Structure 1
Amino acid sequence: LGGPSVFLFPPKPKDTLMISRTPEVTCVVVDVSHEDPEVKFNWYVDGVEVHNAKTKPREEQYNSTYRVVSVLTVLHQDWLNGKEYKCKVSNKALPAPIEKTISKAKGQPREPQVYTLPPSRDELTKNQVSLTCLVKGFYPSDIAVEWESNGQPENNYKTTPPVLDSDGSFFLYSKLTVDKSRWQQGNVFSCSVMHEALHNHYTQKSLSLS
């Protein structure tokens, strides 16, 4: 190998939108020889070097190599404003250090439409029904969808991944599963969506019987 390999990952979308979470870009170096496991990390925010990063203890890989990870916390606003994050990896086995940079996607942000759809009449014969949340017209594809009720987070739901639509934006569906009982009882459910292009980055759409 031309020495180690670097992979720079973006922050968890949820982390970037809540004040109580701390977003971080992650730099992962794989295939770090047992011969030379020492690795040096250099981070840069728009060019300026930063020293707040933190490296984790190396991890022994099953195929006799090392994995070294460096974590750089970032400021919510820095990230959403498009600041570039550069990770510079150095190893004795590396002819020249490897550099990787990432930033939030640029293209026109497009605000998502949220639509809740009740169970199909046919499904109402089953014990569990499907509540559906259609989310479409958004860009970037980074988004977070959740379901809640009575101010509490639901458990049983899966969301499809973002999917490219005909006009260049994305859509996805989230499916909540609940006992036909709860639906019949008239309980109200909400589909929560967090996307940068939404007013205040958050919107909800309720769903219930009748």
Structure 2
Amino acid sequence: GPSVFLFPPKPKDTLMISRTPEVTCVVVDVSHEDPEVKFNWYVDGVEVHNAKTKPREEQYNSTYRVVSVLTVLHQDWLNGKEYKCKVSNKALPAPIEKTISKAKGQPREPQVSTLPPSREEMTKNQVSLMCLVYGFYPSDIAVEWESNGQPENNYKTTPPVLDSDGSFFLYSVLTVDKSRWQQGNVFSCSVMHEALHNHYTQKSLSLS
């Protein structure tokens, strides 16, 4: 029979008012014989009607996947509203319901510790810059890098790690050509999290 997965919005989308967060209800293993899927969506138990219906798409072995996307309001998500996807299909004994919402608990503001290139690092042709981001709650967070108002994409970020006080931490590492660092260019890690003022902070590194 079909399976249902309800994906939360991307943290960056819920935190930036200019972006559009959405929850995504994914139904896989829909049979060729009983392929109609009906979606009902609810926000705190109240039915909403603005979801997009996507055309079914082919999977292997005579099945389809069928997806429905509901745009959410940033403030609704951040206020802890519950989004429910109800999935109806003839092959299902009963409709499948999934509910998702933001993690509960007191939000806590991320702190950042920066780390410039090690002594050994400065001998190579590429250097690494690090931002350790810590003490935040919920674990939903977005970390990106930039320099001189342009994005810097050559970075890797660990998953959030649970700390002993129930907050989270991670690190992000940007790797750049050493010449760009030696020139004196400033590189910054931008952090977006709901507990920050205006959801945003930035820390900077340059050759000192």
Question: Shorter-chain-normalised TM-score: which range?
Answer: over 0.9
Residue 89 of structure 1 deviates from its aligned partner by 0.4
- Divergent runs of 4+, >2 A: none
Deviations for 1:95-122, whole angstroms, at most 9, x for unmatched residues?
1111111111112211110121100011
Deviations for 1:67-93, whole angstroms, at most 9, x for unmatched residues?
110011111111111110011100011
Residue 55 of structure 1 deviates from its aligned partner by 1.6
Matched, 1:28 2:26: yes
Alignment-derived partner of residue 106 in structure 1: 104
The whole-number CA distance in structure 2 between the counterparts of 1:195 and 1:63 is: 43
The whole-number CA distance in structure 2 between the counterparts of 1:198 and 1:21 is: 18
Alignment-derived partner of residue 171 in structure 2: 173
The whole-number CA distance in structure 2 between the counterparts of 1:165 and 1:19 is: 30
Deviations for 1:33-71, whole angstroms, at most 9, x for unmatched residues?
111000101001111111101121111112432111001
SS in 2 for 1:121: coil
SS in 2 for 1:35: coil
SS in 1 for 2:120: helix
If the length of structure 2 is used for normalisation, what is the TM-score?
0.97
Residue 166 of structure 1 deviates from its aligned partner by 2.3
Larger mean CA deviation between 125-134 and 178-187 belongs to 178-187
Deviations for 1:135-190, whole angstroms, at most 9, x for unmatched residues?
01111111000111111111211111111222221111111111111111111111
The whole-number CA distance in structure 2 between the counterparts of 1:65 and 1:170 is: 40
The whole-number CA distance in structure 2 between the counterparts of 1:117 and 1:64 is: 53
The whole-number CA distance in structure 1 between the counterparts of 2:60 and 2:162 is: 37
Matched pairs, number: 208
SS in 1 for 2:68: strand
The whole-number CA distance in structure 2 between the counterparts of 1:158 and 1:86 is: 33
Q: CA RMSD in A?
A: 1.0
Unaligned stretches of 5+ residues in structure 1: none
Larger mean CA deviation between 59-68 and 132-141 belongs to 59-68
Unaligned stretches of 5+ residues in structure 2: none
The whole-number CA distance in structure 2 between the counterparts of 1:18 and 1:166 is: 30
If the length of structure 1 is used for normalisation, what is the TM-score?
0.96
Closer, same or farther in 2 for the Cα pair 1:166/1:63, shift >3 Å?
farther
The whole-number CA distance in structure 2 between the counterparts of 1:82 and 1:155 is: 32
Query: Percent identical across equivalent pairs?
Result: 97
Alignment-derived partner of residue 79 in structure 1: 77
The whole-number CA distance in structure 2 between the counterparts of 1:19 and 1:76 is: 7
